[PDB]
Amino acid sequence: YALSAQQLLNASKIDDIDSMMGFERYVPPQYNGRFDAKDIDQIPGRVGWLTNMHATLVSQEQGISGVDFYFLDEEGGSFKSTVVYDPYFFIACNDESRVNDVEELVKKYLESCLKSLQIIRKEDLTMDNHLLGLQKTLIKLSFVNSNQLFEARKLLRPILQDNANNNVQRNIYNKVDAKHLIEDIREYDVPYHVRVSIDKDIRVGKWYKVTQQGFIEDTRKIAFADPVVMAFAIATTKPPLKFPDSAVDQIMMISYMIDGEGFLITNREIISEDIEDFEYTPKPEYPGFFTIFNENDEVALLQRFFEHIRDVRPTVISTFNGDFFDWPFIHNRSKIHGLDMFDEIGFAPDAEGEYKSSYCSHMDCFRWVKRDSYLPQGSQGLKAVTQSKLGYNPIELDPELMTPYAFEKPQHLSEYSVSDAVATYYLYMKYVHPFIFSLCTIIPLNPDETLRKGTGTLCEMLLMVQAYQHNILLPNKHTDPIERFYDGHLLESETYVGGHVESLEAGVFRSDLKNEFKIDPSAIDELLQELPEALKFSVEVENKSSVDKVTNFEEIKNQITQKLLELKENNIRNELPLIYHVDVASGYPNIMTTNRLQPDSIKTCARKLKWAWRGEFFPSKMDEYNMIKRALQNETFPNKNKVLTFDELSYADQVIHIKKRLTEYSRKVYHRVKVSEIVEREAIVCQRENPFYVDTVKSFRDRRYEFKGLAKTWKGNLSKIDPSDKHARDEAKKMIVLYDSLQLAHKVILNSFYGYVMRKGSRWYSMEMAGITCLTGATIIQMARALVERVGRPLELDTDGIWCILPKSFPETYFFTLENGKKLYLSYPCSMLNYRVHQKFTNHQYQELKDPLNYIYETHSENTIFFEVDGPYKAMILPSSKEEGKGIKKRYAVFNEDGSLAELKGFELKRRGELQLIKNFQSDIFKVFLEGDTLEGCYSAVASVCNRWLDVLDSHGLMLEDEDLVSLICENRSMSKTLKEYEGQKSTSITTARRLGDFLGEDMVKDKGLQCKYIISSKPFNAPVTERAIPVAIFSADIPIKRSFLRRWTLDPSLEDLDIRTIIDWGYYRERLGSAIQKIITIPAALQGVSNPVPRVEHPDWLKRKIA
DNA sequence: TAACCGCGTTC
DNA sequence: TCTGGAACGCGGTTA
Ligand SMILES: Nc1ccn([C@H]2C[C@H](O)[C@@H](COP(=O)(O)OP(=O)(O)OP(=O)(O)O)O2)c(=O)n1
Ligand SMILES: [Ca+2]
């Protein structure tokens, strides 16, 4: 209909644009010989590196469905080739002996849109006897295009919903109709291009030969082709204190880089003078020679950008958040200027509002930064990312100086624009491009989708490929019920008990300051009894060798035994510690694969595993619940298109009202509004189920292990280089960052296999399997702690890792020597626990198909759960709570032996936003715990820094320049949603957002993600802090505006002193600094037996009493 | 006091 | 239409 025409027309537009960019549709010659990959060089065709793919319509050259594929050929050119393929989904039946009856129904019922029918079989993991070869019979419906596939779904849903409802009433005194035989539709929601990419085993990033028969992968060709890559960034005018408006604000410059060649177009109507060619090579490996394009006016600028793009023909354009700032600005500045960007460069927004093209992938690096970098949110800006992954500081410029510096210091502003471009091209080439394009080789998505789709969706794609290739029927996307009940109470949420976290000790621990250890002598007895087989376990399992080939096994056994035996005779010791960290490698994935954990396996073929369920429900019983429902049934409610009734509403809106009224009732009759209960649960895990899910996790884990191991290889290569070989250590350090980043980008995707069984809309949902994963790790990590606390002092614990200190005389690291001369590394702290993990947690019931033809299985033991050890570290600093007895989890600082920071967890320094005074305070303070000869001398050095920070606040800031003051006292906080979505809520961010609007206009709060830079006033006295919160920007406006809003915000019309120094609630920030000093310095010092080093910060009353 | 929320962390 | 999980710290309101 009118949908077809729009789609056929779009295909014609896209076809013309592709040809302008060098993608003419290529048809390979004919061949009547056998189609075999071995004979690839003789089958006529064209070879090309696959760079993109998109669904389209074809007109015998109604529309025909197909997928365009974009190639770069070996002769420096490009072409595209199309594959047609009939879209299809399946109809399931509830009586396989009458499948033809249903077949003859839908042939006539779907005669308007059906192209062909077929009876096919697939394996159904929910079917009885499916592990014996019994398959489910289905009707495969096929169509000419996707719109016809959707037309059939619209005709098939009435049948499915009518069968779910009961039958009509005819003769009350009384072979079923074939319409009732339709059980369900299946695989109806697979995106078409994912369907073609899976069924035809085509992947972006591989080499193919487009022949008449099909696509032949050329395994001979190895390395990727080199696409023409461009990355650009723009700079716009901006009213002071406000945001750029693509309506009124013009753009001044566009800076970009094409394969290393730098460019910068300028808008002379805004920037004052012509800019000469200049260079920005921030580090030697980032060459940046920039040729300038000075143009009269904005149109002239935009056509250079469009003409240059048209001439170099980029197949990848990279930006940094250019999907929601840059591209929409260029578009609107092209609309006002009468330029159609789509006819110019083939770029346009899509359904999600992101800007895309047919021939060119848009690589928004911010998506990679946000999803795969593993960097914190505070470190996700371009400057922080450039500092972390590129190893240099890019040029800075306060955005309020950008519009003026187009006039005053243009060249200064030309160096900032090129900086953003240099950092973006090399961020893409070094990190984003290799990662995403490699991922495309195994994921049936094009580059644009591999970069932006959620990691759970990426997992589902990987799993569907396995499911299809093993002829397993795809389950339909899971749907959660609108209401669930527990014990007669309406549930508000349910979950499983997740990871185990423990705060066990606080204070400073350093390798030069002795500690007191109490060694359980029975513990040493157990280690001595397990020592012979633990060392064998290290040889044969941990290093995949044989004790027959090690030549110092007895020496090592004796040295460890001697060290252990002395520790037993002296169980009370005051020694230097060893600050060690043990962590299970890929904990949850390895827990899953060890126990054959997968959603379809939750049902000696049965392994019972326990998990913990936690529910949150209303205190109201049924008898009450029904009462509030019938109350709302008698009420009127507004329409949404002039008044409706409860039952005339939707089910969703119904329970929305029920929940609100249920909360109110319980808050009165019960006072409590939500009750939480935990119940232990068991689940059967079949050990014989088709392991397509488990095997997918095992493969992707092994994929990550590759890069994780290379990061450890090169960490050792760098430790072997002499400090004088400067060029060698830089290459080694660059390898370390590259592989550490690659293994980290694989980490989120990996652990998303564990999270996917709880994702909304998941095809393989199982709360039980996730709950079992969490409880098992909780058992292992506590088993490990139970041993550490008997031999040393565990400090902190989270999920699968333990930080601890061990006596200096505890057996540490050893090196088996093989007859080959090669050595094997052994760390006894790790091997003692790994022998226990493999004594108590191995799955002895793991099963695999031996003979698949006769369906014979074998049973073996499996366990891939290993602690890895890092250390020994120079220092660890763990903070303590302000409340008595409580600890602080997920926060500490760790230092390497050479004095550099190893880890910094949780603290405000790294968190996004937060109070700059506390941020800057933490930066200066942690490195100071390294000073001092004794523990008491250590705390004194930190107190010196403390009292300097207390001095600036006690002096009401009089010691800082007013520029350093506006930065130290400000606190930034982001707003996830728009301010209108926070109605009925008070906070400092909301107040700042409201006042920013009453002063700079509602056009500021128009967009979510607003940063609220505020300072708290002492002005409304004894008033809630959420009200005394002023936008920092007010101290930067003209004086009348400042006083009006100030006096109003202070409730003091007698206010003429508009100096920020007088408005600040110094006592508030003095108390904030106090809580920081208490938790990092003084209160941990008390738990370590050192009197308050910072007496100006008084101890809590409970601490002063315990001191006595 | 304890429940409770928003944000951004550690797993 | 998209869309991995739970545990936790902290400032701040609220019952
Ligand atoms: N983003 C994350 C981080 C962690 N986890 C869960 C699953 C992990 O198995 C477990 C432990 O977290 P780690 O940081 O130890 O991650 P891994 O054990 O997977 O990796 P590593 O080998 O680096 O320890 O926490 C998760 O689900 N999602
Ligand atoms: Ca781990």
Coordinates of C-alpha atoms (C1' of nucleotides) and ligand atoms in Angstrom, one line a residue, chain A residues 581-588 704 708 747 751 798-801 866, chain B residues 11, ligand 2:
Chain A
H581 CA 44.5 -9.9 46.3
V582 CA 42.9 -13.1 45.1
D583 CA 40.1 -13.1 42.6
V584 CA 38.4 -15.8 40.6
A585 CA 38.9 -15.4 36.8
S586 CA 35.6 -14.9 35.0
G587 CA 33.8 -16.0 38.2
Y588 CA 30.2 -16.2 37.1
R704 CA 38.3 -13.0 26.4
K708 CA 43.5 -11.2 29.2
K747 CA 34.2 -8.5 29.9
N751 CA 29.1 -11.3 32.0
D798 CA 33.3 -8.5 47.2
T799 CA 31.5 -11.3 45.2
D800 CA 34.6 -13.4 44.0
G801 CA 37.6 -11.5 45.4
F866 CA 40.5 -20.6 39.7
Chain B
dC11 C1' 31.3 -6.6 41.8
Ligands
CA2 CA 36.6 -12.3 39.1

